[PDB]
């Protein structure tokens, strides 16, 4: 799915208010622009990786799916390293234009 037509500001607000908190509490690469970043979050959150495959059902993953479904037309150890990369991608997504 191409994230070119998404509403990036509402997704960013949802992350900064809600998704980021769950993403940090779960702890207990880069991207060029906003669509590429969102592609990276989608792939790195909902597509299973080597070993850390159960990340798609986490609560922050539910939040990401909810935000993407609402604001993207037509959308609807190793784990710590993956979530750190996800935090980096989200942080670069929130970068001002």
């Amino acid at each position, epitope marked *: 799915y191409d994230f070119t037509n998404c509403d990036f500001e*509402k997704i960013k*607000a*949802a*992350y*900064l*208010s*809600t998704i980021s*908190k*769950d993403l940090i*509490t779960y702890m207990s690469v880069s991207c060029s622009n906003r669509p590429h970043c969102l592609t990276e979050i989608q792939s790195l959150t909902f597509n299973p990786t080597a070993g850390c495959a159960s990340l798609a059902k986490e*609560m922050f993953a539910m*939040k990401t*799916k*909810a*935000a993407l*479904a*609402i604001w993207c037309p037509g*959308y*609807s150890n190793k784990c710590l390293e993956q979530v750190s990369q996800l935090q980096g991608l989200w942080r670069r997504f929130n970068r001002p234009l």
Partner: antibody, heavy 121, light 109 residues
């Protein structure tokens, strides 16, 4: 305006099954999860589960495992909750709640009027 | 699961006074993951506060929320006639979602 209109009150015998409907209108149906919760008479709210209308991905409460089954019909924008093996304490008011973001915060932002399901012999 | 304890079970407050509803959480949860719902008898619950501090659309400035970790609080500066109802604190942090048993804001006379 967002409306979640539910079916009528149900009276079921113990051991039977009930299908509670919840038709959503006034917004994009496939983009928001429906949670189903229940309120026993005189008790607090009890989360039953949730379903994503986009692709039928359901998460049920552990105690309602194998007893509740959630389906959706995007043609009519309806969400169905099937509670089988009904017993005495399933008598409650069942609410369908659309959950969405308000200023970046995710919660059950819309609720249906509820259906009174009475499971008595 | 997360156990959501509400206090008191019922709160008898005279109209125009200050009301405080406490919600203890069995585990430390984010402020953004706890919300407050208001229900009046014979009506469905209504989303009242998002993320422990953010009033929804239409809720007046009397209501406020504050807390963190395992302790959260709903505060009404001047309780009015329409404020007497059952308030639930609901966490979102982990499945299954759990609600508080509900605090019934009640008229005192």
């Amino acid at each position: 305006q967002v409306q979640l209109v539910q079916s009528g009150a149900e009276v079921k015998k113990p051991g039977a099954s009930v299908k509670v409907s919840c038709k959503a209108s006034g917004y994009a149906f496939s983009n928001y999860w429906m949670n189903w919760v229940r309120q026993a008479p005189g008790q607090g709210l009890e989360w039953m589960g949730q379903i994503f209308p986009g692709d039928s991905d359901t998460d049920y409460d552990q105690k309602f495992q194998g007893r509740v089954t959630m389906t959706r019909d995007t043609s009519t924008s309806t969400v169905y909750m099937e509670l089988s093996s009904l017993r005495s304490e399933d008598t409650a008011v069942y609410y369908c709640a659309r959950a969405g973001y308000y200023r970046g915060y995710y919660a059950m932002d819309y609720w249906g009027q509820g259906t009174t399901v009475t499971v008595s012999s | 699961e997360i156990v959501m304890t509400q206090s008191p079970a019922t709160l008898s407050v005279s109209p125009g006074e200050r009301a405080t509803l406490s919600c203890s959480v069995s585990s430390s949860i984010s402020s953004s993951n706890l919300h407050w719902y208001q229900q009046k008898p014979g009506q469905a619950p209504r989303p009242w506060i998002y993320g422990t501090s953010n009033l929804a659309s239409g809720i007046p400035a009397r209501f406020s929320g504050s807390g963190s970790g395992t302790e959260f609080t709903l505060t009404i500066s001047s309780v009015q006639a329409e404020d007497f109802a059952v308030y639930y604190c609901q966490q979102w942090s982990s499945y299954p979602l759990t609600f508080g048993q509900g605090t019934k804001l009640e008229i005192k006379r």
